[PDB]
From a paper:
Usb1 is an exoribonuclease that shortens the oligo-uridine tail of U6 snRNA, resulting in a terminal 2′,3′ cyclic phosphate group in most eukaryotes, including humans. Usb1 is a member of the 2H phosphodiesterase superfamily, a large enzyme family containing members with known 2′,3′-cyclic or 1″,2″-cyclic phosphodiesterase (CPDase) activity, or 3′-5′ or 2′-5′ phosphodiesterase activity, or 2′,5′-RNA ligase activity. We report three high-resolution co-crystal structures of Usb1 complexed with RNA, which show the structural basis for this catalytic preference and unambiguously identify His120 and His208 as catalytic base and acid, respectively.
In order to visualize how adenosine binds in the unperturbed active site, we crystallized wild-type Usb1 with the substrate mimic adenosine 5′-monophosphate (AMP). AMP bound in the n pocket, with His208 well-positioned to act as a catalytic acid to protonate the leaving group 5′ oxygen of the terminal nucleotide. His208 is also hydrogen bonded to the backbone oxygen of Ser206. In the wt–AMP structure, Ser210 (part of the HxS catalytic motif) helps orient the scissile phosphate by forming a 2.7 Å hydrogen bond to one of the non-bridging oxygens. The syn conformation also allows a water molecule to hydrogen bond to both the AMP N3 nitrogen and the non-bridging oxygen of the scissile phosphate. Coordination of this water molecule may help stabilize an in-line conformation of the scissile phosphate. Comparison of the AMP-bound structure with our previously determined UMP-bound structure shows that UMP cannot coordinate a water molecule in a similar fashion. We also observe that, relative to the UMP bound structure, AMP makes a shorter hydrogen bond between the hydroxyl group of Ser210 and the scissile phosphate. These unique features of AMP bound to the n pocket may provide a rationale as to why the enzyme is more efficient at cleaving a terminal adenosine relative to uridine.
Numbering used by the authors: 78 to 265
Write the structure that this text describes.
Amino acid sequence: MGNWATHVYVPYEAKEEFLDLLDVLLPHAQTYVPRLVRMKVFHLSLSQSVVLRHHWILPFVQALKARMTSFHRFFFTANQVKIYTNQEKTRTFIGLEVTSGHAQFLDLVSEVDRVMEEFNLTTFYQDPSFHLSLAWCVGDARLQLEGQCLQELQAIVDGFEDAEVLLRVHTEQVRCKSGNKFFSMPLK
Ligand SMILES: Nc1ncnc2c1ncn2[C@@H]1O[C@H](COP(=O)(O)O)[C@@H](O)[C@H]1O
Ligand SMILES: [Cl-]
């Protein structure tokens, strides 16, 4: 029944405050790169996007659930704007990089990585930069977005007052997308 795109992540609850901040941030970035498009759903990756044989989807999800069930929830901060590209530099992303909480994300990834290895899937980047992507475009737009634009985006973020949105975000769940299927699991 096919091989399915499979990706593990921490869902980020995009509250109105957050989406309203993006209503300021994104047009600002679009003055440099108009073709940026807002993300539809917001996540912090714990795995690469891999491909997994259909009959292993449910077993994979169960393996993840068992490990995540024991993993304690934690707080993180994601308020540092950073530009990412995919590996081929055919997509560029504006993200909010995690600072405080990064070590807890590393611990999460260590558990996810074990599952990846159990299913012969690629483990996460060895130099991970955990982040919430806010917008993306085709191509390599680093030259337009880094420097002045990034500085201005950071200034907007630095000026934003609700700590719960970016400064003290509580992880609640992990999710695995496989194809068009989404499997949620609570952290402890
Ligand atoms: N050090 C890194 N850690 C995590 N993702 C990264 C890193 N460098 C670049 N990225 C890329 O960031 C892109 C967007 O990330 P995501 O929003 O998690 O899908 C992915 O295509 C990753 O390859
Ligand atoms: Cl453009």
